[PDB]
């Protein structure tokens, strides 16, 4: 089997991805954010409380006649601040039109003010491994982890676009999707991610610095988070850029064009284009804007989020050995 989503983003910033997603019978479709970086399908509900719950689609299992209760179990996650939680049922979970079976849907009791003033998430889709998943007593599969075995190659495929949609392809490969050849490079599992280790980078047209930099292939993370010598070296190419403590991250004149920058994948390189890497006005009016590249300094891990993954075709291999792929469009 195979499945293939188109993902729109939720502003025009970019600043995340929704995807259809059908559950239950009749279906119920819900918009979900897609993230390769946790491991949970959880949804607004029924069960949410009222006040938490401001423009959302909700999931009613009520409704549905394949939904099941599992009994006794719960979840709870803490991301960047936010959290929810709730109980759990299993119910059928479609995506582009690949079919799972009794799918842990997690059904959100109570989320963070985040997650309530985002009118355009109704949940998110978790694609990172399952070992990651908060489910207890009896923790839960992945929506990947329960279709690899049915999918026509255990794969899928982020493709996202800049201001713009793009496509989840579940169990193949969209050789028409990109350009070149796609570089695999090796997975580490052993935090839950799919992480990786880059080869270096570039700024602009600068010449290339090669440095291994390890990090998670993200799609729920919107920038990209990088060693602050990094990170440094990138703004000091923008005139006027600077670190603002109140802002919380680098900051630069909204006058300015900014430079590309590199990032390698093993003996490739992926280029995300100056604009990518504009996040707009730190507050409405202003004439200072927001970097798209800032530092990862506390938090504790590199994250190639949206900024660099929309730049690329992205492989999520999950063979026996799971690998990354990396291809230019
Ligand atoms: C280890 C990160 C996992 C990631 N899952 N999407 C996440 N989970 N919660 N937030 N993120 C992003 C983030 C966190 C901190 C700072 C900036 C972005």
Do not use: M
Request: aromatic letters at 12%; hydrophobic letters at 35%.
């Amino acid at each position: 089997s195979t499945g293939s989503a188109t993902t729109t983003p939720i502003d025009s910033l970019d600043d995340a991805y929704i995807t259809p997603v059908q559950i239950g019978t009749p279906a119920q479709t819900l918009n979900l954010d897609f993230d390769t970086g946790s491991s949970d399908l959880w949804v607004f509900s029924s069960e949410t409380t009222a006040s938490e719950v401001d423009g959302q689609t909700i999931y009613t299992p009520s409704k549905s006649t394949t939904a099941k209760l599992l009994s006794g179990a719960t979840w709870s996650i803490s991301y960047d601040g936010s959290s929810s939680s709730g109980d759990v049922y299993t119910d059928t979970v479609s995506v582009g039109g690949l079919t799972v079976t009794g799918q842990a849907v997690e059904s959100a009791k109570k989320v963070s003010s985040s997650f309530t003033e985002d009118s355009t998430i109704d949940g998110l889709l978790g694609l990172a491994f399952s070992t990651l998943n908060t489910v207890s007593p009896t923790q839960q599969k992945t929506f990947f982890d329960n279709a690899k075995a049915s999918l026509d190659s255990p794969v899928f495929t982020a493709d996202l676009g800049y201001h713009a949609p793009g496509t989840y392809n579940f169990g193949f490969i969209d050789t028409t999707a990109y350009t070149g050849s796609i570089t695999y490079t090796a997975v580490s599992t052993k935090q839950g991610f799919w992480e990786w280790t880059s080869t270096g980078y570039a700024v602009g047209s600068g010449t290339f610095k090669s440095t291994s930099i390890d990090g998670i292939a993200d799609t729920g993370t919107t920038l990209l988070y990088l060693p602050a010598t990094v990170v440094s070296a990138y703004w000091a190419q923008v005139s006027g850029a600077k670190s603002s403590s109140s802002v919380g991250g680098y900051v630069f004149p909204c006058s300015a064009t900014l430079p590309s920058f590199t990032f390698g994948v093993g003996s490739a390189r992926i280029v995300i284009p100056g604009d990518y890497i504009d996040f707009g006005p730190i507050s409405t009016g202003s004439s200072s804007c927001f970097g798209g590249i800032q530092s990862s300094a506390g938090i504790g891990i590199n994250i190639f989020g949206d900024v660099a993954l929309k730049a690329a075709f992205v492989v999520f291999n999950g063979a026996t050995t799971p690998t990354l792929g990396f291809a230019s469009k």
